Ligand binder design. Structure first.
Ligand SMILES: C[C@@H]1CC[C@@]2(OC1)O[C@H]1C[C@H]3[C@@H]4CC=C5C[C@@H](OCCC(CO[C@H]6O[C@H](CO)[C@@H](O[C@H]7O[C@H](CO)[C@@H](O)[C@H](O)[C@H]7O)[C@H](O)[C@H]6O)CO[C@H]6O[C@H](CO)[C@@H](O[C@H]7O[C@H](CO)[C@@H](O)[C@H](O)[C@H]7O)[C@H](O)[C@H]6O)CC[C@]5(C)[C@H]4CC[C@]3(C)[C@H]1[C@@H]2C
Ligand SMILES: CCCCCCCCCCCCCCCCCCCCCCCCCC(=O)N[C@@H](CO)[C@H](O)[C@H](O)CCCCCCCCCCCCCC
Lengths: 99, 67, 554, 183
């Protein structure tokens, strides 16, 4: 995508200080769309559901970049967790390929 | 109607008239004293105060009257 | 030294049902309100007491303020070891300094027994209170584990939906059986179910807007709503008697704030004109936008806002309108739609409508209604939706049941009886109190009837004497109110009946005669003559005459 | 040194004579959001005759003791009224009730009256009452200039001088006699 975290932080801080009504950044949208693409690809092929970190960028004040998360609870079984880990690893590897 | 679990408290007038306490000869003075005490006590701050300060203010008013 | 846990009482069904909701006596005790059709709202009129009452109030407060400082100074100067909370131990400041806690310690402390009272069971028309004994001066309490019933005129259940046996309770239990009590998380990743969307559409249709949103808490709703679309370059014009949540939300938003006097529209128009002309501070550039915040019904005063004038002004000067109505969304109106129904104003004129379910529907939460193209943006721009927990299932079931009951779908003729009962009760109580000789505020239909007590030392006496008669009331005072005017706020409910009101009228008449609380002038009666009616005549003649809409000054 | 992101630091005076700095945008919003309750009660109903009633009672109580002299009694009631007014109006700075942040931490009640608007009727009444009291006291009975000069000096410097617009928003800090005042 050709952008860094510091540039995004400076752009957001400048936009907040200038009090501009319209706050739209393209590379952030592309990154969010890509991560949602991994999520959807993992959902359609295999019956495993994960989610990404949902944030509002225009309200934050400290630096932050989009990410992904996986949760677990105390009612699961080890074999299913291992199978899900393998499935999500395969999904990530397949989506990140074709460079 | 239907009964409930409420205990109704009778009013002062009903209790007095059913108790036979009302006596014309020796109750008018009591009522006058009650009125004089309550009127004096309510309209002036004694009821949010402390015992020492309330007694001090009572003595102050009593001395003011006596002088 | 600890609050005991009270064992539930075992009683037959009929007795408990009567305790929760009271059966009607006669069908002549109902009243159906009528629309206004847009006729102008007259300026309110307020009555005043004589001078000597105010003079005595001033002397009382002056003496209290002097003595408080005398004690504070002497105690802080000499007896240091006793007061270790207000002194620094080892290079650490105290949690709070003495000055900001002066009012709480010096005058409020002597009255702490009339403010917080533990209760148990469902709050209906009879509430069970725990018995407690005071030690020292309201420093700590000792409990003997004894309970006794009282009549409640202090709880927010206007339509009487707080019950333990009914269709709403059945729906809540069924929802608990079907959906568990646990939620998933924020309503952007997991935690949204079909019940949420059903409640959304039901509320949107009930209000009359096009789309809506539902939140788990009302205070958070107001505190987080404003920062999504307001900025430093905008202006907010609001009344002087708004709720704390609006103030917190506006503070977090960061915009400029101008305030106008209560009930004045000439001043409002002048302020709008001046603010439009002047512009931004120190630069005199035009504002980006202007927003008007108001309240549907004010609980401390029991008065309505003149909506048509606000709509006219916002149409003429191109401004936006925000209306807060939590006390008037279910208890007021010919059919209970809100403030937009009595005045005949089309709902599309107002921009944002907000309300809470706590007061009338018996469940906790809040909502917001607006147009589709606004809700679509707000569902993305809000911080409550993607960062905070979601609403549970039983509360949603209770709210849906209450709304379908009021709308007239699930049960044919239950809501209308409740509306008529609450209207009649409010009118009868207000008229009887005014004919006795007291002073009340209101607009002849609000469920809030504030009776004014002026001397500082009369509120605790009134509270304790009403408690001895087995009646529960709530009294407010400084600074929540103007210094001179203290009051007791009555909250009328549909569950109470007429005989309860007669009992209350007799007891309050006796207590007021004892405490010298009835001081009325000719500005409160329509004939211009001060009226002191005897009690039995009031009871005989008021319920018939309370229906005619000419006996009320405002 | 390291610079804070958001700075709200109290600064004290650094000279014998000084004036308090004008407020900022955020402070102005904080003061305008919520009405002030320390200055509202002055303009309300029955708030003017109260001073007259207090004066009448103070005269009677000080005259009640047989041993007092009329000149001495009037001087003592002047002592009481002037000291009470000075303590309430000009001595104490702050608000007993808590407002947003510090808020009115620097100004006195006389400065807070009527949103700092000058030449208001309440101010006229409050400045005229001590003058009328002084003239009534002077004309009422015989006097000698010995205590008269000091009495008029106290009346001027404890009641009149603080009310002038020149002393508005003004702070005086002696290096050792008086503590430094926040600006
Ligand atoms: C018949 C007979 C005749 C004679 C008689 O009896 C009857 O007639 C009786 C009639 C009496 C007078 C009646 C009425 C008053 C007014 C009262 O008014 C105080 C109100 C002020 C505070 O005073 C309280 O609190 C003080 C706290 O220091 C106590 O001081 C120390 O007390 C102890 C040592 O003394 C030790 O504990 C410590 O050394 C320390 O606590 C003091 O005692 C106590 O009164 C409020 O103002 C301040 O508020 C903040 C304080 O919190 C200050 O700080 C702030 O500064 C920045 C703002 O600029 C902020 O930003 C910062 O955050 C923040 O730090 C702020 O500057 C300043 O404005 C002061 C007393 C007086 C004259 C009485 C005297 C005694 C009599 C003559 C009796 C007499 C016996
Ligand atoms: C041998 C004899 C020698 C004689 C020597 C004479 C010595 C004189 C001693 C003087 C003692 C009295 C001096 C101070 C007493 C009063 C000072 C109180 C100040 C305490 C803090 C004030 C804070 C204000 C915030 C506040 O709560 N404000 C208001 C509400 O929001 C406030 O609560 C209410 O409005 C009530 C105040 C109105 C009552 C009318 C007062 C006007 C006349 C003052 C004369 C004082 C005369 C004292 C007998």
């Amino acid at each position: 995508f050709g952008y860094t975290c510091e540039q995004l932080f400076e752009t957001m801080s400048a936009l907040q200080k200038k009090s501009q009504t319209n706050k739209f950044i393209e590379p952030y949208e592309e990154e969010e769309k890509f991560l949602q693409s991994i999520v959807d690809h993992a959902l359609i092929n295999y019956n495993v559901l994960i989610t990404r970190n949902t944030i509002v960028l225009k309200q934050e004040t400290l630096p932050i970049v989009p990410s992904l998360k996986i949760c677990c609870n105390a009612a699961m079984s080890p074999e299913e967790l291992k199978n899900a880990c393998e499935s999500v690893k395969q999904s990530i590897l397949a989506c990140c390929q074709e460079s | 109607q239907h009964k409930s679990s409420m205990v109704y408290i009778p009013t002062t007038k009903e209790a007095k008239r059913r108790n036979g306490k009302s006596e014309g000869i020796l109750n008018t003075i009591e009522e006058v004293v009650e009125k004089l005490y309550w009127t004096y006590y309510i309209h002036l701050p004694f009821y949010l105060m402390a015992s020492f300060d309330s007694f001090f203010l009572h003595v102050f008013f009593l001395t003011i009257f006596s002088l | 030294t600890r609050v005991p846990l009270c064992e539930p009482e075992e009683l037959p069904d009929d007795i408990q049902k009567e305790n929760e909701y009271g059966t009607l006596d006669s069908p002549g005790h109902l009243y159906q309100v009528k629309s206004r059709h847009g006729k102008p709202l007259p300026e309110p009129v307020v009555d005043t007491p004589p001078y000597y009452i105010s003079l005595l109030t001033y002397l009382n407060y002056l003496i209290l303020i002097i003595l408080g400082h005398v004690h504070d100074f002497l105690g802080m100067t000499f007896q240091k070891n006793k007061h270790l909370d207000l002194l620094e131990h080892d290079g650490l400041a105290p949690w709070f300094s003495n000055f900001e806690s002066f009012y709480v310690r010096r005058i409020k402390m002597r009255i702490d027994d009339c403010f917080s009272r533990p209760t148990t069971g469902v709050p209906g028309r009879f509430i069970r209170c725990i018995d407690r004994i005071s030690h020292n001066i309201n420093e700590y309490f000792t409990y003997s584990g004894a309970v006794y019933p009282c009549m409640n005129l202090s709880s927010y259940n206007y339509l009487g939906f707080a019950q333990s046996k009914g269709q709403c309770t059945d729906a809540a239990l069924e929802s608990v059986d079907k959906y568990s009590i646990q939620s998933g998380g924020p309503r952007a990743q997991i935690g949204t179910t079909d019940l949420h969307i059903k409640a959304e559409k039901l509320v949107a249709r009930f209000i009359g807007k096009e789309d809506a949103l539902v939140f788990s808490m009302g205070y958070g709703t107001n505190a987080n709503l404003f920062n999504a679309f307001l900025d430093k370059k905008c202006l907010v014009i609001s009344d002087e008697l708004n709720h704390t949540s609006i103030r917190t939300g506006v503070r977090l938003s960061g915009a400029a704030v101008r305030t106008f006097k209560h009930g004045d529209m000439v001043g409002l128009e002048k302020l709008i004109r001046e603010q439009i002309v002047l512009g931004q501070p120190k630069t005199n550039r035009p504002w980006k936008k202007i927003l008007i915040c108001a309240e549907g019904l004010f609980s401390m005063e029991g008065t309505l806002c003149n909506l048509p004038k606000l709509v006219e002004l916002k149409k003429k000067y191109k401004c936006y309108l925000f209306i807060d109505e939590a006390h008037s969304i279910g208890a007021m109106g010919p059919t209970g739609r809100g403030v937009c129904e009595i005045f005949g104003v089309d709902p599309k004129d107002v921009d944002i409508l907000m309300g809470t379910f706590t007061k009338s529907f018996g469940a906790a939460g809040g909502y917001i209604a607006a147009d589709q193209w606004i809700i679509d943006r707000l569902r993305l721009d809000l911080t409550t939706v993607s960062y905070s927990e979601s609403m549970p299932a039983p509360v949603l079931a209770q709210t849906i049941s209450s709304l379908q009951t009021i709308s007239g779908e699930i049960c044919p003729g239950q809501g209308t009886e409740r509306l008529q009962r609450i209207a009649f009760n409010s009118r009868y109580l207000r008229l009887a109190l005014q004919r006795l000789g007291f002073i009340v505020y209101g607009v002849a239909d609000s469920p809030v009837i504030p009776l004014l007590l002026y001397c500082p030392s009369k509120m605790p006496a009134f509270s304790r004497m009403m408690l001895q008669r087995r009646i529960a009331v709530v009294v407010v005072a400084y600074p929540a109110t103007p210094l001179i005017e203290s009051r007791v706020r009555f909250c009328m409910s549909a569950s109470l009946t007429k005989e309860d009101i007669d009992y209350l009228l007799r007891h309050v008449s006796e207590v007021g005669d004892k405490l010298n609380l009835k001081s009325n002038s000719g500005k409160s009666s329509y004939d211009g003559k001060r009226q002191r009616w005897d009690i039995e005549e009031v009871i005989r003649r008021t319920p018939e005459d309370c229906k005619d809409d000419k006996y009320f000054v405002n | 040194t390291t610079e804070p992101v958001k700075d709200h630091r109290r600064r004290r005076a650094a000279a014998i004579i000084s004036h308090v700095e004008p407020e900022t945008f955020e402070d102005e919003n904080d003061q305008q959001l919520l009405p002030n309750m320390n200055a509202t009660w002055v303009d309300q109903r029955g708030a003017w005759i109260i001073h007259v009633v207090i004066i009448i009672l103070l005269k009677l109580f000080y005259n009640l003791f047989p041993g007092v002299t009329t000149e001495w009694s009037w001087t003592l009631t002047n002592m009481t009224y002037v000291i009470g007014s000075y303590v309430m109006f000009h001595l104490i700075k702050g608000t007993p009730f808590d407002f947003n942040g510090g808020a009115y931490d620097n100004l006195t009640m006389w400065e807070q009256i009527d949103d700092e608007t000058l030449y208001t009727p309440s101010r006229k009444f409050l400045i005229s009452v001590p003058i009328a009291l002084f003239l009534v006291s002077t004309h009422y009975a015989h006097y000698d200039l010995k205590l008269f000069s000091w009495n008029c000096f106290l009346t001027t410097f404890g009641a009149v001088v603080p009310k002038l617009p020149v002393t508005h928003r003004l702070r005086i800090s002696i290096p050792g006699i008086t503590g430094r005042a926040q600006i």
